């Protein structure tokens, strides 16, 4: 099977930092496109980073500066660093393979609270 395995996420002040960690396992990381997708309570799915298999990555305007996306082939590991946090970015964080196609895999989720 699949495992993608989110942690990094905690409460913290706007204005503040995390780096979320997803440890993937059981499909070929390296050819595989990677997403970070967030559910905001009371919303359904949105997708917040995507990074492909050269390293080019994409993200939704709201986050464009604050947010970086970043993969560790060696380590099997894909990063989200989150800068300068809102209470807006509260939301249940989400690793994904491939969430595009094909074969499309979603791990467990990592919490984020931002408030003062």
């Known amino acids: 099977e699949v495992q993608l395995v989110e942690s990094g996420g905690g409460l913290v002040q706007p204005g503040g930092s995390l780096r979320l960690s997803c440890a993937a396992s059981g499909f070929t990381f390296s050819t595989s496109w990677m997403y970070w997708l967030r559910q905001a309570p009371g919303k359904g799915l949105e997708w917040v980073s995507v990074?492909?298999?050269?390293?080019?990555?994409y993200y939704a305007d709201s986050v464009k500066g604050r947010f970086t996306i970043s993969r560790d082939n060696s380590k099997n590991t894909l990063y989200l660093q989150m800068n300068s946090l809102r209470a807006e970015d509260t939301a249940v964080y989400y690793c994904?393979?491939?969430?595009?196609?094909?074969?499309?895999?979603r791990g467990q989720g990592t919490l984020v609270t931002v408030s003062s």
């Open positions: 990074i492909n298999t050269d390293g080019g990555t």
């Open positions: 994904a393979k491939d969430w595009g196609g094909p074969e499309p895999t």
